[PDB]
Amino acid sequence: HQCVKLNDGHFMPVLGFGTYAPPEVPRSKALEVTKLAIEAGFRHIDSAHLYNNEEQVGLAIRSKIADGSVKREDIFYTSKLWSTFHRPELVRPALENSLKKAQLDYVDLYLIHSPMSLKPGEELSPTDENGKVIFDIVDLCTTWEAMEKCKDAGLAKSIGVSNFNRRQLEMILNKPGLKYKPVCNQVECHPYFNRSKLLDFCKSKDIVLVAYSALGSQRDKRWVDPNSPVLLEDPVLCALAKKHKRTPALIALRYQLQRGVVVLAKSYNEQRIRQNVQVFEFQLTAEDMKAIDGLDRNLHYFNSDSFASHPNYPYS
Ligand SMILES: NC(=O)c1ccc[n+]([C@@H]2O[C@H](COP(=O)([O-])OP(=O)(O)OC[C@H]3O[C@@H](n4cnc5c(N)ncnc54)[C@H](OP(=O)(O)O)[C@@H]3O)[C@@H](O)[C@H]2O)c1
Ligand SMILES: CCc1cccc(NC(=O)c2cc3cccc(O)c3oc2=N)c1
Prior knowledge:
Layout: E1 3-5, E2 11-13, E3 15-18, H1 28-40, E4 44-46, H2 54-66, E5 76-81, H3 91-102, E6 107-112, H4 140-153, E7 156-162, H5 166-173, E8 184-188, H6 196-205, E9 208-212, H7 235-244, H8 248-258, E10 262-266, H9 270-276, H10 286-293
Parallel strand pairs: 3-4, 3-10, 4-5, 5-6, 6-7, 7-8, 8-9, 9-10
Antiparallel strand pairs: 1-2
Helix pairs in contact: 1-2, 2-3, 7-8
NADP nicotinamide-adenine-dinucleotide phosphate binds at residues 18-20, 46, 162-163, 186, 212-218, 232, 247, 249, 264-269, 272, 275-276.
PDB class: oxidoreductase
Keywords: Cancer, oxidoreductase
Assembly: monomeric
């Protein structure tokens, strides 16, 4: 039920449903599970142009509005501007296209998906003849201006960023004629990478930290090294789960909630979708918090080193 107030005065529900699924999963699944997530109790729905599912997710949202389950105002829907669209003149059309695909009039939240700008084209990851991705050099403050223009148009209620570090955040915050702060910064966050310093920064600036891969990544072969620790197998989360008679995933999500982090949970399984909303049903002790805090290994699951060269590469 709980929401946090955003620095533009809108409210963001603190538990969000992640909708990304690999290309293998049929697109119809995005429709089904998103309706399930809404039926379960989620009111915050995270998507993006990249995820190739905005048609299905928007259809689920429209279906739940139209069967009378919720109203548009109950749903907090997030889309993301992809990095082939960072040139300012490309920002508003991308949003419009996302809206046309999702069949909604506005998103509650529009994010700059990543700081590292790509070559503009009809392709989503443009690669040259050797298969290397072609970068673009764009001053992200101009991207931000185009984002602010989307806010004034009513196309996005709130605007924020994702995968930005301290430097990129303050580069937006120092911006001359800044009309709107980012309400939020959506970054990878879980017990093996808690972002305690980044989070403290944000709390100072009134920017919500939004955790993704907060259950430990879906562990795609393409992006994640399978030898990395499995977060939901962690001994301390398994211990706390048996102690509270919950599950490791519930421990992880509650961990974020109690340290003031809005947390995303992806699940395409109906039982886990309905289980994840029990995060509001129990609390961890300050000592449980301490023991999870102690798991921090500054561990990225998303291996991005073919982009280290990028001037805007987030964690240099
Ligand atoms: N801004 C960014 O760059 C960025 C990057 C990555 C992700 N995201 C967003 O964050 C969302 C979530 O992150 P994510 O995709 O990395 O996945 P995640 O939330 O870390 O979840 C990972 C896996 O945990 C499993 N799981 C879910 N609930 C569970 C439970 N109660 N018990 C045990 N296992 C459970 C799910 O498998 P089942 O489906 O089988 O349950 C899921 O595939 C994404 O869907 C996307 O919206 C954003
Ligand atoms: C300058 C563009 C650029 C350059 C280098 C890396 C990236 N990052 C990604 O490939 C992403 C993968 C992804 C995957 C699943 C869900 C997401 O939400 C994701 O988000 C991403 N940004 C972007």
